[model samples]
Target: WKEATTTLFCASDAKAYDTEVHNVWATHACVPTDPNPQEVKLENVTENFNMWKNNMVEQMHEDIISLWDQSLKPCVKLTGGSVITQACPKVSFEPIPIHYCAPAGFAILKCNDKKFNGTGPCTNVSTVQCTHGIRPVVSTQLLLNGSLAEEEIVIRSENFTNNAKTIIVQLNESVVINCTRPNNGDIRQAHCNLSKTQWENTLEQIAIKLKEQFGNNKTIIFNPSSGGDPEIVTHSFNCGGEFFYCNSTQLFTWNDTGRNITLPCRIKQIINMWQEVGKAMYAPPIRGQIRCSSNITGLLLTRDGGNGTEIFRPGGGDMRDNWRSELYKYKVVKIE
Candidate 1:
């Protein structure tokens, strides 16, 4: 494999930056690297692409199930996505655009991973297995009425993982609930922390709040656990991923936009994930060292090549040709 270098970036709040500063850290992966540049036929690349496409098709379920078995994480965060607050007014903040590395290809996804959850920009709560590497918590702060009194409620999460089960109510106030993750189903009948009816009402309240406060093409990673009061973690951030509950009875009203919300939360993410996988798999690679395109044209014909005229002026003018696209349309590259 060849030693390749690619650019990566993160912005303010993580390490305090508004622009570019380069650094590197090691992350372990099962994939192998390449060595030595070598030429290969375009048709061979096509074959490999199609093979991986089918691989994704077949393994999609198991690939997703494993991620569901663990704590779920949001693929990406949008400001004001969802949050719990004791006293807060608005949830809007200046959107920060930070650079993140999202490889456009089939990949292993562990959204629960502290560092990377593989979401793409524009949205990633559920996309491909991985698109973004950073867990960005969209946040803002609330200050006094601009009065002489300086009071504040920090609205943010410690990280994406903590964003899960982070109930921001108070201290030592606890309760019990039974909520285990399931496979291939939205939900089933369940119990409350202490009661059957009254406590179950709390679950409905939780579910209703979920439908009310969240769901806008972003992931809501709220789980208080299936059994016992798991000491809902808290952070100074007055806001975080939404926390909801499930019950034997689900409440839904007519034409409620989020009525189709699924329990276990994963069912929703998995549906979107598979959809993303299919879309991502067939789509062409977005960025890479070697690129083959069919739509480049209008370059100066500098010289004559074996089969087509050579246009090599990349320094100036526009470049295109119907050539490359049709080049491989019918005739495979003939090896010399």
Candidate 2:
């Protein structure tokens, strides 16, 4: 911090050309003394303070300029790579650059808090999670978009707990979906089978596929309470259809203008929370059926890290790397 001292005075100069009253020249001088002594000095105690004030103001301006340059300049340069100046109405720095890239199998370092300790193109980490003071790590994958390839991966840790939720994004050619927490863990152990029918496979179809592949000749071991459905039955013993309709019908019925209606028009506008859980669990099969008409050219699985959507296709650059084609090898391809 710099301190400044100011002093003010009034003086009259003698007129050499006119012989006016010269008493003013010999008037008593009002000299001001410095109350506090410091390292900086003034040449004349009275008149020199003006020059002192100007110097102080200039020094303050320079100090402010230096402080701004030192603190914010590096951040601007690193973020944008180069400075941008735009003059529409007035001249000022324009859009700053942002980097978004994550390397493969990136692991975050854990200490008092989570920090990154990965290498190469793992830039722009937005969030992190710690488990036992250890940072959660994420894995990376690539996808193809038309003729281009790109990376798709982002991991955000929700902290350590009994239900520490983590998000995993997998990019398929037709659509991308995120499986979270409990569902994510289930997929690893799940026995997945491709449906033969082009028609959208209902929950029943998935169940049938699971049983045909993994279920024994006698009984299939499935949690009755799982899939948000209460009934649990063996595949070969109970039913012939892919799904067992508990209500004895494929579609739940409703009357729009019936006097003795169970589900009125107003009630139909609101979703039954009880149905939501079951819907979420069964939605994948439903989606697969719906999207069967379109071609699905690619599939991807991305772990946690960095920014943007959880799944990415390569071809993008990080803060330090140059934009080139070699980085695009991981792009996901479309499947028809």
Candidate 3:
């Protein structure tokens, strides 16, 4: 085995921090009139500052979601199936167990025509005539006037060829036969006691006179940028034409036959990336100037009318700010 040694040397002039010493400073200079500072100043400072501020603000929103996931991951593993994050304040978890079918005893009721099937004690039925159907005819109905006729209406069952409920009155020659309930039995004892004329008068009074038709109440959505079917309401303002009152929200204004109108001062480019970090990061010296790349340019042009004037300038000031903001946010590589 052989031994080896290593030697180290350094130039003494370079400054190094020593933990054992402390020093004090008297004052700092403001540098109010420096000709050219080391830091680069952006030409369009206001717009650039706003874009960087917007980016940092957006990042804070994503951090909230990340924090929630950090607290939820481990609990999800122990539960075995799945775990839900309680980002929503008003919800709760409940699991229902599965059930399988099994046979069980139940009661069955059978009514015999011998009780009323033959013309024994339950003979002499009544009839009610209703030109319109009864209140509860269409699967579901509510009676506006709750009154039952004294006479019982005659009815027949599809189950048997001859089985029928016979009432005492003779119906008109052109009357139609209506069967109410047939599945359970011929009739429940409740309906058997009414008289023929009273049932017919009650049926006429309880009938629905008429129903009103309705139109849809929902609002339809349409995009003016790409033409589509006319909806109840339109959302955006159209430019370069005399549009009449197209409902409450939309309008067409602008005599100039061009698409390149400057966007309103309040409208801004929403910097999606860096908004969440901090507004201070937007200072040009700290974070370089954002470039306006060509991808953000708007240059679509409409064909000119007979007078040699185009209705709209498709690629103009309206689209410039958006393209400017796109380059501002992503084109520069951060030195640090």
Best by lDDT: 1
Tens digit per residue, CA lDDT, model 2, 136-197: 00011111121111222122112312122221112212222211112222221212112222
**lDDT measured at residue 112 in model 3 versus the true structure, 0 to 100:** 16
Q: TM-score for all predictions?
A: 0.16, 0.16, 0.15
lDDT of each: 0.20, 0.19, 0.17
lDDT of 3 by residue, 142-193 (tens): 1111112123221111122211211111111111111111223222101111
- Per-candidate clash tally: 21, 24, 32
Question: Alpha carbon lDDT of residue 67, candidate 3?
Answer: 27
Model 2 C-alpha lDDT versus the unseen true structure? 0.19
